């Protein structure tokens, strides 16, 4: 198959897979993604860093073969697996079949995870690596940095010394599938918004670990050596500090003044409330986003939560409970643990017809999920003008609090 490697540096090639078609990946919406694998060709040896999702071997291999042709090398000598998830290890068995002499470099935990996914690999040779271990390729060296929980127990980064390229696995990734490989080659908005969505959905709960790893990267003296970050999805950063800074901002709760209003409704009263809350918040000059759960994906909602100092979450009561769609978001939030960056303020609200109970339930679940629920607005059925005014005031107050 005809698929070209893309040169990133002398002897460093993107040889990944363009998944134009993927639209939902573990309840993350996207418009395609990529599975970036890299071929690092030293004078002596060739390493493949990561691979790709099952069934994409033909593409990865076509690009690998192109890159080997370009550097005039014969084979991949070392298979590096920064992470075991199947979008990055899904053709490992096929790569092991193609390059039977290539040891697989990965963390110890990764070996276990790989073997569980691919029991036939028991026969393969694994080189377990820990932080600071080095693979010498001849004029190119790869230094491994274990990155447990960033985003998986098996994860590591691989730093190409000399080129200063940090192969960061999913970290700094973005789910974008562009024919352009570099950050600077696409609109900055799209790049950063995808980076943002990726952090919000995948990195938020790891935020404290990400800061700790950055400290470590700096302590080990690696930070100053990073000229490029080449993640496992999306664009390669020729401006690594842009994404480091953004990750530090995101990990530390740096936000512009913004309220995200999220609601669902059966009969529309909670929607009227949500608009009034949004109007109120807008009145204080903060940015405002409004999401309806019936329509909007949790992955986009949490993207804006990342950049919001407060949220408002609304739902009617159905048989003493919140409308169940908030259950999905709230479970997702419980996992993301936004409090790990910033304990965001929350307003809970909703219409009800009887004893209510949605806002209380939501308040409890938001607490569990690391939000500071200061206020609640609850309306019996259809909000009166006064009640809608009170919702505006609630949103104004919420916005004023995060100013």
Ligand X SMILES: Cc1cc2nc3c(=O)[nH]c(=O)nc-3n(C[C@H](O)[C@H](O)[C@H](O)COP(=O)(O)O)c2cc1C
Can you say which residues are annotated as belonging to the binding site for FMN?
265-270, 317-320, 351-356
Give the interface segment with ligand X, choosing from 127-135, 236-244, 277-285, 352-360 (CB under 6 A). 352-360
| 323 lies in the site for a second copy, by CB under 8 A | yes
Sole residue written with tokens 């995060």: 402
Residues 6+ apart with CB under 8 A from 31: 23, 175, 176, 177
Planar angle of CA 299, 302, 304, nearest 5 degrees = 115
Q: For residue 77, what are the contacts with CB-CB under 8 A and spacing of at least 6?
A: 45, 46, 47, 99, 101, 102, 137
> Scanning the structure block, which residue is given the tokens 């940095």?
145
- Binder of residue 337, out of a second copy, Fe ion, ligand X, none (CB less than 5 to 8 A by kind): a second copy
Among positions 355, 385, 386, 403, the unique one binding ligand X when judged by CB under 6 A: 355
- Which value, to the nearest 10 degrees, does the dihedral of the CA atoms of residues 312, 314, 320, 324 take? -110
Q: Is the Cβ of residue 107 or residue 265 nearer to ligand X in the bound state?
A: 265
Is residue 381 a contact residue for a second copy (CB under 8 A)? yes
Binding to a second copy in span 123-142, by CB under 8 A? none
Give the C-alpha distances (Å, rounded to integers) separating 83 from 90, 137, 138, 310.
11, 21, 24, 34
How far is residue 184 from each of residues 175, 331, 367, measured CA to CA in Å?
16, 36, 40
Contact assessment for residue 351 and residue 269, using Cβ atoms and an 8 Å cutoff: yes
Judged by CB under 8 A, the residue of 127, 192, 246, 266 near a second copy is: 266
Residues of this chain, 18-77, that bind ligand X according to CB under 6 A = 26
Distances (CA, A) of 161 to 39, 175, 242: 14, 26, 20
Query: From the CB of 309, what's the least distance to Fe ion, in Å?
Result: 28
- Which of 86, 98, 208, 212 forms a contact with a second copy (CB under 8 A)? 86
- Cα 367 from Cα 377, distance rounded (Å): 17
Q: Which of 216, 321, 372, 376 binds a second copy (CB under 8 A)?
A: 321
**Whole-number minimum distance, CB 12 to Fe ion, in Å?**
20
Q: Does 328 bind a second copy (CB under 8 A)?
A: yes
Can residue 235 be called a binding residue for ligand X (CB under 6 A)? no
Site residues for ligand X per CB under 6 A: 26, 202, 265-270, 316-320, 351-356, 381
The residues binding Fe ion (CB under 5 A) are 85, 87, 170, 232
Residues that bind a second copy (CB under 8 A): 24-27, 84-86, 113, 116-117, 119, 152-154, 205, 266-267, 294, 298, 318-332, 334-337, 353-354, 380-382, 384
């Amino acid at each position: 198959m005809k698929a070209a490697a893309k040169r990133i540096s002398d002897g460093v090639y993107w040889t990944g897979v363009l998944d134009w078609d993927l639209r939902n990946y573990h309840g993350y919406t996207l418009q395609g993604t990529t599975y970036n694998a890299y071929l690092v060709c030293g004078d002596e040896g060739v390493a493949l860093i990561d691979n790709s999702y099952p069934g994409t071997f033909d593409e990865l291999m076509a690009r690998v073969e192109d890159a080997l042709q370009q550097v005039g090398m014969e084979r991949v000598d070392y298979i590096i697996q920064n992470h075991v998830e199947k979008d990055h290890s899904g053709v490992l068995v096929e790569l092991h079949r193609r390059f039977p002499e290539a040891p697989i470099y990965c963390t110890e935990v990764a070996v276990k995870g790989l073997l569980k996914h691919y029991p036939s690999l028991r026969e393969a040779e694994f080189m377990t690596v820990k932080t600071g271990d080095v693979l010498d390729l001849g004029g190119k060296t790869l230094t491994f940095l274990e990155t447990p929980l960033l985003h998986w127990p098996d994860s590591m980064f691989t730093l190409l010394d000399e080129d200063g390229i940090l192969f960061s696995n999913d970290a700094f990734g973005q789910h974008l599938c562009c024919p352009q490989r570099l950050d600077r080659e696409i609109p900055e908005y799209i790049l950063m918004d995808a980076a943002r969505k990726f952090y919000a959905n995948l990195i938020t709960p790891l935020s404290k670990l990400v800061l700790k790893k950055f400290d470590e990267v700096k302590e080990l003296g690696l930070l100053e050596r990073i000229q490029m970050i080449a993640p496992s999805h999306g664009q390669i950063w020729t401006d690594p500090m842009k994404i480091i800074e953004a990750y530090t901002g995101w990990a530390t709760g740096m936000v512009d003044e913004r309220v995200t209003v999220i609601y669902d409704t059966m009969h529309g009263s909670t929607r009227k409330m949500a608009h009034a809350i949004a109007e109120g918040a807008m009145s204080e000059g903060v940015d405002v986003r409004v999401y309806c759960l019936h329509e909007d994906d949790r992955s986009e909602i949490v993207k804006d939560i990342l950049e919001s100092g407060a949220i408002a979450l609304g739902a009617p009561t159905i048989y003493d409970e919140p409308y169940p769609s908030v259950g999905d978001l709230l479970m997702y939030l419980r996992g993301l643990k936004f409090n790990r960056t910033l304990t965001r303020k929350a307003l809970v609200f909703g219409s009800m017809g009887g004893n209510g109970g949605a806002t209380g339930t939501m308040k409890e679940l938001l607490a569990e999920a690391g939000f500071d629920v200061a206020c609640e607005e609850e309306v019996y059925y259809v909000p009166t003008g006064d009640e809608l005014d009170a919702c505006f005031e609630a949103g104004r107050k919420l916005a004023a609090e995060i100013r």
